[PDB]
Design a protein around this ligand. Structure first.
Ligand SMILES: CC(=O)SCCNC(=O)CCNC(=O)[C@H](O)C(C)(C)COP(=O)(O)OP(=O)(O)OC[C@H]1O[C@@H](n2cnc3c(N)ncnc32)[C@H](O)[C@@H]1OP(=O)(O)O
Length: 163
């Protein structure tokens, strides 16, 4: 290795089957908790280990340095971005953007062209740089009760251009 690697991981049924992945999931849980201090740790753990959620992990030298936890809604035509974070010492180097670009490529391949997410006010600018907007095109009837709403957050959407 010696270089960064992208891995789409998660818990398919039980996290005890693959210990390498389990270690990465715990690593993600910790990174998410550390960079998302206002989010209950038990809450982060619950979602990161939920079989319906996947996490695109950014690993360098076997260690998790960032990731995006998401949930795919193929029939609804979109994916919910649940957690997004890069460990502090690795931030401001381009990894956060690198992670989102990789996630976009993955979804273009699965033919899902919309991301929905609830952004904390002080993170809005990050999403805007990644092409997200406060203008929502996915109908409310399509996401209400599907995506989780948060306190004081702003719903934002990213329309992916397959090119
Ligand atoms: C659904 C949610 O998860 S909402 C919560 C989102 N997450 C967090 O707030 C957790 C704490 N923050 C982080 O983990 C990081 O700051 C991340 C993941 C947002 C960004 O990761 P990084 O690796 O630092 O970002 P990267 O180096 O790719 O920078 C992305 C670009 O966004 C820009 N940007 C604009 N506004 C912001 C902002 N509010 N925060 C961060 N970046 C911003 C940066 O200037 C940078 O552009 P530049 O390189 O041209 O200057």
């Amino acid at each position: 290795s010696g270089i960064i690697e992208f891995h789409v991981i998660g818990n398919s049924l039980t996290p005890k089957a693959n210990r390498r992945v389990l270690l990465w999931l715990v690593g993600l849980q910790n990174v998410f908790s550390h960079q998302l201090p206002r989010m209950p740790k038990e809450y982060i753990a619950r979602l990161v280990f939920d079989p319906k959620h996947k996490t695109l992990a950014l690993i360098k030298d076997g260690r998790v340095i960032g990731g995006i936890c998401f949930r795919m809604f193929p029939t609804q035509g979109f994916t919910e971005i649940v957690f997004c974070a890069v460990t502090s010492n690795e931030q401001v180097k381009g990894y956060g953007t690198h992670l989102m670009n990789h996630l976009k490529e993955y979804h273009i391949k699965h033919n899902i062209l919309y991301f929905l997410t609830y952004a904390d006010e002080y993170a809005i600018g990050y999403f805007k740089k990644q092409g997200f907007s406060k203008d929502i095109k996915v109908p409310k009837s399509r996401y209400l009760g599907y995506i989780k709403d948060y306190e004081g957050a702003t719903l934002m959407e990213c329309e992916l251009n397959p090119r």
